[PDB]
Design an enzyme around this catalytic site. Structure first.
Site, short mmCIF file in Angstrom:
data_model
loop_
_atom_site.label_atom_id
_atom_site.label_comp_id
_atom_site.label_asym_id
_atom_site.label_seq_id
_atom_site.Cartn_x
_atom_site.Cartn_y
_atom_site.Cartn_z
N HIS A 15 5.50 1.67 88.42
CA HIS A 15 5.86 0.62 87.64
C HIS A 15 7.40 0.53 87.33
O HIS A 15 8.15 -0.28 87.55
CB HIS A 15 5.32 1.12 85.96
CG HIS A 15 3.79 0.65 86.17
ND1 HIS A 15 3.29 -0.21 85.03
CD2 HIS A 15 2.78 1.38 86.76
CE1 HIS A 15 2.03 -0.27 85.23
NE2 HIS A 15 1.71 0.64 86.19
N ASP A 112 5.37 -1.89 79.03
CA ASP A 112 3.87 -1.44 79.16
C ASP A 112 3.23 -0.83 78.18
O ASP A 112 3.90 -0.19 77.50
CB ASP A 112 4.04 -0.91 80.27
CG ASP A 112 4.08 -1.14 81.79
OD1 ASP A 112 3.35 -2.34 82.09
OD2 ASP A 112 4.90 -0.68 82.64
O1 LIG Z 1 -4.77 0.14 86.83
C1 LIG Z 1 -4.72 -0.39 85.64
C2 LIG Z 1 -3.53 -0.36 85.05
O2 LIG Z 1 -2.47 0.10 85.38
C3 LIG Z 1 -2.61 1.71 85.59
O3 LIG Z 1 -3.28 2.22 84.60
C4 LIG Z 1 -3.63 3.61 84.96
C5 LIG Z 1 -4.39 4.20 84.05
O4 LIG Z 1 -5.74 3.97 83.90
C6 LIG Z 1 -2.30 4.37 85.44
O5 LIG Z 1 -2.49 5.68 85.97
C7 LIG Z 1 -1.29 3.64 86.41
O6 LIG Z 1 -0.33 4.14 86.54
C8 LIG Z 1 -1.11 2.17 85.93
O7 LIG Z 1 -0.78 1.54 87.13
C9 LIG Z 1 -3.46 -1.17 83.71
C10 LIG Z 1 -2.14 -1.49 82.80
C11 LIG Z 1 -1.04 -1.40 83.24
C12 LIG Z 1 0.15 -1.49 82.60
C13 LIG Z 1 -0.13 -1.96 81.24
O8 LIG Z 1 0.94 -2.37 80.44
C14 LIG Z 1 -1.32 -2.40 80.78
C15 LIG Z 1 -2.43 -1.92 81.68
O9 LIG Z 1 -4.58 -1.85 83.34
C16 LIG Z 1 -5.90 -1.78 83.87
C17 LIG Z 1 -6.71 -2.52 83.24
C18 LIG Z 1 -8.10 -2.45 83.68
O10 LIG Z 1 -9.11 -3.05 83.32
C19 LIG Z 1 -8.17 -1.77 84.87
C20 LIG Z 1 -7.13 -1.03 85.79
O11 LIG Z 1 -7.21 -0.50 86.94
C21 LIG Z 1 -6.00 -1.00 85.18
#
Ligand SMILES: O=c1c(O[C@@H]2O[C@H](CO)[C@@H](O)[C@H](O)[C@H]2O)c(-c2ccc(O)cc2)oc2cc(O)cc(O)c12
Ligand SMILES: O=c1ccn([C@@H]2O[C@H](COP(=O)(O)OP(=O)(O)O)[C@@H](O)[C@H]2O)c(=O)[nH]1
Length: 454
Positions: A15, A112
């Site tokens: 990010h 985020d």
């Molecule tokens: O992978 C996902 C994700 O981002 C990711 O979420 C992971 C935690 O689950 C985290 O480890 C990673 O760094 C991140 O890029 C996010 C997310 C990212 C930023 C935001 O402001 C809000 C949501 O939503 C998701 C929603 C889903 O239904 C399925 C996903 O697979 C993600």
């Protein structure tokens, strides 16, 4: 008139890096950027600040939450199971965010995850902008209102089909829908279930934005705008900007010894550790191809060095043809190196863009994450720019033979599937790099941001 934008990305290199890429593009247009970053992580980000007179870093002290390892600031510092605690720590920066906003007074804040923020900003006269660098096809699939209203009645078979109105068709495997149905309910920071959190951000923010362009992400952004009734903007595809640091000489020297297009580059991002059996299967499959390879992998679960986890005799067999390395490397510069003919990728959103804008053939090895899986389906079945390694329907495991076959297919000049994915990748690269594509995306993006603060 130029805008003052604050940037508050999640504490993850996936990010921070694209938020900084976009920051550079906005600063080139005269906009002033206040970039909030974990304190120690700032030193790794100066590399990419191309407009230091307009982009200023403001350090955050990542607070203590019980269980968080000491000094940890980013998902690159913790195992994936500790992500929810790192979320609680980002939730806890609220008082020092609220004071940063009060004195900097930006017009907009990109963020985020922190669904509390739109209540602070509405009070300060600041507009909240939820800015996603993951695929809008993912948020559309898991977090649109039809999904949320089924609440805890949402099951694995429910997640096997798209929500009502979803603009596109693709198939999930049983174990993937099982993963999405269970992880959805798991707490991710401060006792909030994961999908509830993202849904709270979507519902409360003033506006939403995604990385992407109309040509690819368009149908999902239209769906989300129709569902949530507020602007859903596209920043453009966030083409990587050039770093101030040249390619490390040891990698440039080693990569320079291979024939053009002969090397297989494999990397699964900076947040994941494979299980040992799949670590072995991946490495033995690379070996089976006979191509030189560079594999950037963390040691598998339960192991601390790459040495100790390699399959028996592996080092002695691959000799100087293959390196397995666990440190952070300059992935963007490696993918531009002419030696690289194939990219085996976990299908992270940033790695996908980096492969698309280069010449390497794509082999899709999505790891167990909704965005990786959906990116893999879209790249493999819709854009058809890569070949996906087969996984067991119920166990989600691959064989070394399936890794070998995928790489062999795309590396074979005479294989028709390989020629097809090369041709389709060229079409997508030519679009993303078109002389007016990103600039016209940003033209519209900045106009819609101006409307937002009007
Ligand atoms: O992978 C996902 C994700 O981002 C990711 O979420 C992971 C935690 O689950 C985290 O480890 C990673 O760094 C991140 O890029 C996010 C997310 C990212 C930023 C935001 O402001 C809000 C949501 O939503 C998701 C929603 C889903 O239904 C399925 C996903 O697979 C993600
Ligand atoms: O050793 C590494 C690992 C990752 N990256 C960069 O880290 C980002 C990873 O983002 P992505 O969404 O691909 O995956 P993640 O690491 O978040 O799983 C991309 O810009 C990669 O180029 C890098 O430069 N070196």
């Amino acid at each position: 008139s130029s805008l003052h934008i604050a940037m508050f990305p999640w504490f993850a290199m996936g990010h921070l890096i694209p938020y900084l890429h976009l920051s550079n593009k906005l600063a080139k247009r005269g906009h002033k950027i206040s970039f909030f970053t974990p304190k120690k992580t700032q030193t790794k980000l100066e590399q990419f600040n191309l407009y230091p007179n307009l982009i200023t870093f403001y350090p955050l002290n990542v607070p203590h939450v019980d269980g968080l390892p000491f000094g940890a600031e980013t998902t690159s510092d913790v195992a994936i199971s500790l992500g929810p605690i790192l979320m609680t720590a980002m939730d806890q920066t609220q008082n020092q965010i609220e004071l940063l906003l009060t004195q900097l007074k930006p017009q907009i804040i990109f963020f985020d995850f922190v669904f509390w923020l739109p209540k602070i900003t509405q009070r300060l006269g600041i507009k909240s902008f939820l800015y996603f660098i993951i695929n809008p096809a993912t948020i559309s699939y898991t977090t649109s209102p039809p999904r949320m209203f089924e609440a805890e009645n949402l099951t694995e078979v429910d997640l096997m089909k798209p929500p009502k109105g979803y603009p596109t068709s693709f198939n999930l495997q049983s174990h993937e829908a099982k993963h999405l149905a269970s992880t959805r309910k798991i707490e991710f920071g401060s006792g909030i279930p994961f999908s509830v959190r993202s849904y709270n951000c979507l519902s409360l923010t003033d506006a939403i934005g995604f990385k992407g362009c109309r040509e690819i992400e368009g149908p999902y952004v239209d769906y989300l705008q129709e569902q949530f009734g507020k602007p859903v903007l596209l920043s453009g595809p966030v083409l990587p900007e050039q770093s101030k640091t040249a390619l490390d000489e040891k990698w440039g020297s080693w990569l320079g010894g291979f024939k053009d297009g002969s090397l297989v580059y494999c990397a699964l991002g900076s947040e994941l550790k494979l299980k040992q059996d799949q670590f072995h299967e991946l490495l033995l499959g690379l070996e089976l191809t006979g191509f030189p390879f560079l594999a950037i992998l963390k040691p598998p679960v339960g192991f601390e060095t790459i040495e100790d986890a390699l399959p028996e005799g592996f080092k002695e067999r691959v000799k100087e043809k293959g390196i397995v390395h666990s440190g952070w490397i300059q992935q963007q510069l490696i993918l531009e190196h002419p030696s690289v003919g194939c990219f085996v990728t976990h299908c992270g959103a940033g790695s996908i863009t980096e492969g698309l804008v280069n010449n390497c053939q794509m082999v899709l090895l999505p790891q167990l994450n909704g965005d990786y899986i959906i990116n893999a389906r879209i790249m493999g079945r819709h854009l058809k720019v890569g070949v996906e390694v087969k996984k067991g329907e119920e166990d989600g495991l691959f064989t070394k033979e399936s890794v070998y076959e995928a790489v062999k297919i795309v590396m074979d000049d005479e294989n028709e599937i390989g020629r097809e994915v090369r041709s389709n990748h060229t079409k997508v690269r030519n679009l993303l790099l078109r002389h007016d594509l990103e600039s016209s995306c940003l033209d519209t993006f900045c106009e819609k941001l101006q409307e937002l603060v009007s």
